[PDB]
Amino acid sequence: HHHHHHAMSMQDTLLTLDTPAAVIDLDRMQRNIARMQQRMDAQGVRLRPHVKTSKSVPVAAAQRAAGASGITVSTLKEAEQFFAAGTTDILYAVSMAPHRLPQALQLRRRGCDLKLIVDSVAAAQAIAAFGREQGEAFEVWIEIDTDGHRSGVGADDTPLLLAIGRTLHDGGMRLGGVLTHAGSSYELDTPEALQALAERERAGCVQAAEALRAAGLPCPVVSVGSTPTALAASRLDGVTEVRAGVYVFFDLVMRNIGVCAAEDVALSVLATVIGHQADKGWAIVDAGWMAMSRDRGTARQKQDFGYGQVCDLQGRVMPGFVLTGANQEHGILARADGAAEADIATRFPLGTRLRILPNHACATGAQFPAYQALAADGSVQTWERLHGW
């Protein structure tokens, strides 16, 4: 039992970690994983989780174990990490830059079934010319703009859809599908508006696929998604897969959109109280914006949580206390309502540990080299995640 005794001596808990730390409540993370996978199984579509929220091998392993099919990545560094870890079905869902083609070629030549996306004739021409030069039939999907959010060919822009699809297909590449991301779902906050946007996202992606196929071009995959529209879609006829990422943890922006409650948020930042300004009702904590990130997505929503909702050590919300301000390594904990708490030092004594729910899980997670994955027994384990490009 030499290993056992030594490992027990080294095991951390929420009391022994240094702060700040990004804590994943594994039981909440597994409920979120199951909820999404079950919804997609009920819809008869594949779930291709977007790992840009955690960039962590063990978190994606849990998603794969639950039934996910492949992943979506936001950078080729994520494709390199997850392919090294055994994931071969990877979609790089950012408009392809020609200068990154040698790295995408190398990944495919090592055995990664890496898919790229474009939304322009010039990007299609760059991929097809390099593929012909290098003897590589890249798989390329066409990105569709279904809601005005960001990149993509308009769903009704048949001439440009065909021009890009022909450039790829005639060029000897594999035109593998269409995808869309209805990111404007983050501006909504009612179930009726989310359900309608989910239907516009489905209808527009399938419209683009049907236009390509009406021109004789292959388009076997139809991929949609954002977490809110994944959870709100009534029907997904014509869709092969849904992509969703932030759901794995949720956050307060998702709580305000209405697709989860604060009790579903699996990621919190463990912080210590390091001081006060008693006459202003401030407790000062060691989670500033370097821990929380500068994300303030809740500022324009129905309930502004400042730099995060305060919870006790046990992870239960402490209503009315939020981080009202943040500097790099100092957070200002005070009443959301703008009163000065009396006796703030008795409410929050020096050295008290608290947990802060984030505005945006993807933004807060990226501030940490690793998560501390919290098991039901109170034990944590360090789960590394990727930083940079």
Positions in 36-65 near ligand PLP (CB under 6 A): 50, 52-53
End-to-end CA distance of the chain: give it in Å, rounded: 42
CB 153 within 8 A of CB 142: yes
Q: How far is the CB of 62 from Cl ion (least distance, A)?
A: 22
Q: Is 226 in the site for ligand PLP (CB under 6 A)?
A: yes
Site track for Mg ion across 2-41, x = CB under 5 A: ----------------x-----------------------
Catalogue the E-assigned strands of 44-103: 46-47, 71-73, 89-95
Between the alpha carbon of residue 154 and those of residues 149, 178, 354, the distances in Å are: 11, 12, 47
Q: Is 108 in the site for ligand PLP (CB under 6 A)?
A: no
DSSP assigned state of 303: S
Nearer to Cl ion, 206 or 323 (CB): 323
Q: Is 183 in the site for Mg ion (CB under 5 A)?
A: no
At residue 117, what are phi and psi to the nearest 5 degrees?
A: -130, 150
Q: Is 93 in the site for ligand PLP (CB under 6 A)?
A: yes
Number of amino acids touching a second copy (CB under 8 A): 58
CB 231 within 8 A of CB 40: no
Q: Is 58 in the site for Mg ion (CB under 5 A)?
A: no
Task: State the residue for tokens 């983050």.
Answer: 186
C-alpha closest to that of 385 among 57, 64, 33, 77 = 57
Among 25, 119, 147, 341, binds a second copy (CB under 8 A): 119
CB 104 within 8 A of CB 92: yes
Positions in 282-341 near a second copy (CB under 8 A): 284, 286, 289-290, 293-296, 327-330, 332
Among 219, 246, 269, 333, binds ligand PLP (CB under 6 A): 246
Site track for Cl ion across 180-219, x = CB under 5 A: ----------------------------------------
CA atoms 229, 230, 234, 235: torsion sign: positive
Positions in 51-90 near a second copy (CB under 8 A): 52, 74-75
Using CB distances below 5 to 8 A depending on partner kind, what does residue 332 bind out of ligand PLP, Cl ion, a second copy, none? Answer: a second copy
